[PDB]
Write a protein that binds this ligand. Structure first.
Ligand SMILES: [Cl-]
Ligand SMILES: [Cl-]
Ligand SMILES: [Cl-]
Ligand SMILES: [Cl-]
Lengths: 493, 493, 493, 493
């Protein structure tokens, strides 16, 4: 684990349109903070409806038939993505520092697990550019029919604060591989890594207006993207609550395509026959990764009666080993929550857990005089009606529940409006396949948890989302299928 | 062309739930009319929110893990669809009579071209059932990853009045092939063919609750489907206006998946070098098919200056050969419009054409003392700002425009919020491929028009729709992709 | 299980070319026998090089550009295959009687498991006809590129005697779905079911010369097919020995495509943790199905030391329950071997087992005064150097071996030139995936054996074959991929 | 076009096994010559059966389950191929010099068109590594079925002399992307570029024994590869004559998989309506590229009567503009033939052309006192029975034929045992699609010729080959499809 040997100087703070840096139309700026110390890092230009309109006009111009981006070979789009990957790899130390410092993310994890996922996912997306293929079709009658997988057009992409750099590349990588142009709105909490990457898109040599990055607030710049009459598709990751507003505003405007990656209340099911140490470690890392600020957090762990007491005991032993502090300091194993709103929501939900009669095993309160830190918390004897079993906490809070009947636990696991992910722990082949078939969740891990890679599609059932990201399947939602049917004199097979 | 040798008796008039016939919860009924004579055909049970709730509970029960529909082999779902196709083939005379009598559709076309498309599309969909495959994925790390293409769940399907039986099978065929259960709402104008087909689903031997058909009105039963908290996906075909309300209500409720097939203002481009008789006949059949009540109607025909006068002349000759009357009577070549609302809208738009200074060449008025008949109408010298060049008419009204520059005409062809289809007429290979690449339309025909078959995907760009129906690609929107990742000791390639 | 209420009269005995019945050019005939009674059933026309030349000329004429078979829609090829399936279903009683009577196959199995597999596989193949698609390709430069999946041409298909009707449909079903024409050579032992099916191809209404069936001997008619200068592809199932001669003669003639499905020496591996009764029953049915005359026969069963004695004991109990006799008689549970050559080879190998020091547990000799019956035989304490552990027996002879180390048993399982199939019996998820990855075999069953269905590809590694039959993947070997690259003025993505 | 500013020193001359340099077992060496000057360049180690056996043992060891090559992630195989591409890009000057100097290839073309194709194809193949996917299958019964696309094993690859570096990467790129190990035998005329690339495979960091390169002669080392009992697949490009021996020896040994890319006698068809200057230039470059030493050489150009005389005239004008000499010297536009055997064969065929009564238009003889140079030659009034219209010349010799009827010319175009490629020149959409459908050729160019790119499959019909290289489709022949079927308690859709 190497480290940045100079204190970080932030450089890129402006709106990025046509490969140039712009002040806001209003002239307004907004502050960005470090959540470990609550002190200002810099001022960033505040985009609004007028700035989004300028970015969309630039993206539409770069998408015109006969433009550089539309005329270059599919393989050359790939080359630009692979070139950008090499530049992200070059700037890995300073991007991981900026991610840790701005996002409150453990530095070790930002360097070894977020930036490695950024580089790997970009390289994977580069590889698809010239392998996106349509079909030739043996239609009835004297016709020759084929499909083009065309790009859709201008794609509006709203990035969340929990994985700012990883989620930026999960959106722009497929969008640009398929040949779209993008208007990106990074989260108000975390604009800084997206603007550094804009500087690298210019350096990699993308044509101007292919990538535009407009920082700003959700109700202003985000609503402007969702309601715009010339954006063809909107991708949003964030709260289920705002997801509903994005899909509403797409209907009311121009029936733009909507993909959503939203909250979860993801179950683990640990059967009597499971390797108990393997299940304790994966369900633990499942919930406590990045201070529980993961959509896939393993927030409901159901354990069979016979091993329940031993599971809880070993879970609590593991949760009492954390060292809280600034996530840039060596030895620190848990950083802060992102902001006051999230911190308040987490402590409010912990208080309902205690009050509604869950057993607090450890933690259960704040830590420190500055920074938004929550002690890692474990609740046992949780029941399905409690707020901590129904609502996404998005904090370091583990819920452990008891079951006896496998039919019953799958009913309880599925009794939610969420459906992003699930974990099943068993030694048995039949149980692995039948429980993974029965759970209404987009990702099932068996005997592991939180294993996410570029080659696999990822996304929610039910109110956890619409559509899928990455893998073969994820590139479908950034193309538009065009059928071409040509009359010919006589068809021959 | 055989004919039904007995006058039609209508039998199935009720709500279809769990393979049984139900009265409405309210007790209410609504009338169904013949649009050629304006006389009542029968009374049909009026479904509302209470009837949709009962149908969705039946569909959810039939979709439960361990149910008959979920446990039967993929090949057996196929067998039931192929069996249903054979029963539709058996009842082809009485279904085509009912389609003609209720929908105002020429009998020849209902028998030879709608019922043949119904049978062919069902047989095609049957064939996909056991060939829908997921992926095994070479993920990084010591894991085995695969995808299931699972069914989504309960699918709400709202059928339009223009192609009642064809659009019913385009929706239920893919939905049932992929293993979903369905709640169908046929159009208030045209419920009768959908309820006959419900009787054949029961006879084919589908498990109860797999198909439920709730007739009723759009603002009541249709809004109940779009806003329901336990419908997983809604498919709608109809006006762009109602499409916007369906996608809005999906956002506000449960982020259900939304596919839309909406209006068009579809261009033909006829170049100087085109086979002129071939282009006149296809652009003519393109606009006048089923009294212009096609989403793909060729409602803007752009013709190069040098051949423009000859095109208009030959077009008008062709349009003056029609014989209006009851669409069941032999020799009749144009039937009525569906209802008074549509008839009024068409005559109102024809009046704007005359007033705004388009040249009326023929027709331009109503016909007859009963039935909603419009004379087939041709306008020449149409300009892009006129109401008849901007708004979907959905009537027998042809617009013919002039151009000189190919760059310019593609700009004008693309200057619309619609984008369902386009036709290009040329002898030149370069022009066929480059114009089909440049037009922002989901289907391009070259040297033909209106050629639609089960093997090809069909759907809109822009406000003409979201997603695609039929072909390989159309089945993607009735599956939910589930990733399963299993930890293993050591991976080997 | 219904039965044919009349004694069978054989009708179709001639060469089938251009939908007409031909005598042999030589005038020669050959006898066909019942292997349960060794008495002649009928005389069949003996095809040779002159008869194959006539069939190939008819198949080439039916494959010409502009012919009925080449001009009909892909969906219509499908319709003819689905129509043929319905006629096979109609003649199921008499085809299963003919299969049992001529092939020595248990009637129950011929009716309930071979004819059901014939009908199911044909219906599956029908479904692919209009879904075989090529690609549109985003090639570098100003070009439009696509692929056609064309048919290859005239396909020579040599059918074995062990599954005469099932293997006929596994060959003609994919070949005709992809639009090829066929020259079929059924096995000299078993021509009768193939000629009945020829009568049904004529009745279904295939164009003449699309299917031609030339009965005869392997060294004459079979060698004529493999060496012919105008056959584009040869498919052969049979002995590894003749497989080598077919692929040699394809090289020496016209580099025709060769697919081979050949012998096996297929292992089961039964781990200590396996459900022992489930493993005994599946490994038993695995080896004794159709008197061991299966390429996939489970002819080497490796059992972990700790459960070995109990496995052998329960295996021998199961093998002593068989009732030998005519396979048409109710209650009979084992029929005869096909002919004297096979019968002699089986008894010769049983004698090596005894002599080389394997422990005979039961059987080990002939049965009866007529018919080619072998007692069901079990050998325990078999070692890897014995002839019965190295050579394909193709008779009712089970070998049971001991192991202690899992690393070691997979080495021993893979130490063969064969590689058609394998079975793994375990409760453990890790062991199922890692052992299936490590075994060099085309089909792995886990916790079952001999489960073969139309939706899955099937075929050998190593000397058990080249290429694959059925599933998506199997249709690749009956198409020829044609790339078409067209110059265009400017490409746009 | 940069140039190498130092005279080339050759370094790598030995057999490459396990990432180390070996002398031949025999101790024997063979000379390598420059064909422009006929002088020796160096001595290279002569591999035989003993050296191939050592390489295959190393390749089998590197392919063992649990080895570094088998355990590394699919994405890491990709990374090694992309790393190798960057090292080939670094050594582009010295590889293009070595290609020109050893192969007799124009330096401009070796640098700008062969090394660019090498780099582009490797980068494309890298991109497939982690996107090669099998299937999950909805099989009948209570089973879970999937496929692995496994690597086949040890792949023997015989490279021709005409495109030594390009054809090396077309073979090793797909083979290594799919995870196979390789034993390469470069052509005896041209070993030097393959051994330089071996040095770069070691440097890129491939595990030892994954790539082994054994230079030597065709009858010794090539026959050893084709007959070896532990090579799983053999790929050969070269003469149709040797192709037949390779496929024969695969049958007689171990039924190893055989892919062949062989000769052609490729037609162009130029219709009356074609852009004549575009057709003259592409048919010219089609035949004269790399001194006609292309399998796809446009060796039969059929021109419609009305434009025939003008075509021949403009063709001869173009062919008289060449400047012969050493292919490293600036300004030179045609290099030598490869060796004396090829040179003699070309002059012998030119003499038959004159004698059998073709009209010699230009050239028709040797040039120079050293080097194997042939004057660029044009024949008009060629008929289908002449040796120059039937036999592959593999020299700079253009044949131009007359036709009147389009039905007739396609018959004549198809009347050959060859079928690698074809060119069609027309302005008409119908003619482009119908003539490309009718020609029995693996690649059809329309209005261009010789356009070959990594994204497209390439390969022959008939005796021009078995199987396909590059594109999606080409990777199928370097995987082995393994079906895995697992018994489960109850299946749910
Ligand atoms: Cl998928
Ligand atoms: Cl598609
Ligand atoms: Cl497969
Ligand atoms: Cl392909």
């Amino acid at each position: 684990l190497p480290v940045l040997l100079t204190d970080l100087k932030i450089q890129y703070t402006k709106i990025f349109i046509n490969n140039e840096w712009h002040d806001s139309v209003s002239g307004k700026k907004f502050p960005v903070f470090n959540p470990a110390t609550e002190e200002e890092l810099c001022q960033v230009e505040e985009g609004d409806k007028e700035d989004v309109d300028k970015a969309v006009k630039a993206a539409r111009q770069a998408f015109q038939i006969g433009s550089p981006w539309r005329t270059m070979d599919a393989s050359e789009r790939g080359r630009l993505l692979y070139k950008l990957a090499d530049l992200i790899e070059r700037d890995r130390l300073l991007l991981a520092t900026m991610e840790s410092m701005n996002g409150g993310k453990l530095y070790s994890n930002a360097y070894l697990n977020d930036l490695a996922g950024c580089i790997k996912t970009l390289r994977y997306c580069a590889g698809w550019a010239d392998k996106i293929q349509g079909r030739t079709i043996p239609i009835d009658g004297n016709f020759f029919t084929y499909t083009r997988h065309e790009p859709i057009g201008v794609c509006g992409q709203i990035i969340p604060w929990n994985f700012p750099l990883v989620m930026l590349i999960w959106k722009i990588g497929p969008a640009l591989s398929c040949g779209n142009t993008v208007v990106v709105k990074p989260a108000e909490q975390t604009p800084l890594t997206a603007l550094h990457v804009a500087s690298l898109i210019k350096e990699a040599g993308f044509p101007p207006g292919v990538v535009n990055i407009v920082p700003g607030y959700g109700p202003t710049a985000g609503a402007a993207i969702s309601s715009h009459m010339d954006i063809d598709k909107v991708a949003f990751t964030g709260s289920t609550e705002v997801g509903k507003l994005i899909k509403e505003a797409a209907g009311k405007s121009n029936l733009k395509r909507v993909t959503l990656e939203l909250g979860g209340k993801s179950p683990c099911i640990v059967l009597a026959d499971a390797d108990l140490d393997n299940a304790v470690e994966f369900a633990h890392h499942g919930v406590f990764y990045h201070q529980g600020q993961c959509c896939i957090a393993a927030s409901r762990i159901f354990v069979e009666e016979s091993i329940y007491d031993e599971f809880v005991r070993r879970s609590v032993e593991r949760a009492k080993k954390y060292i809280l502090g600034n996530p840039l300091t060596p030895g620190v194993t848990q950083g802060p929550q992102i902001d006051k709103e999230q911190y308040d929501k987490i402590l409010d939900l912990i208080e309902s857990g205690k009050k509604e009669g869950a057993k607090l095993e450890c933690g259960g309160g704040p830590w420190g005089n500055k920074g938004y830190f929550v002690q890692p918390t474990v609740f046992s004897n949780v029941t399905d009606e409690m707020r901590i079993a129904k609502e996404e906490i998005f904090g370091p809070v583990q819920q452990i529940m008891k079951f006896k009947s496998l039919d019953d636990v799958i009913k309880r696991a599925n009794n939610t409006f969420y459906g992003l992910s699930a974990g099943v722990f068993t030694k048995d082949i039949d149980k692995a396949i039948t429980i993974s078939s029965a759970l209404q969740a987009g990702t099932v891990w068996v005997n592991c948890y939180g294993v996410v890679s570029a080659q696999c599609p990822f996304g929610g059932f039910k109110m956890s989302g619409n559509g899928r990201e990455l893998g073969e399947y994820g590139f479908h939602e950034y193309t538009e299928v065009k059928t071409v049917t040509v009359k010919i004199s006589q068809k021959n097979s």
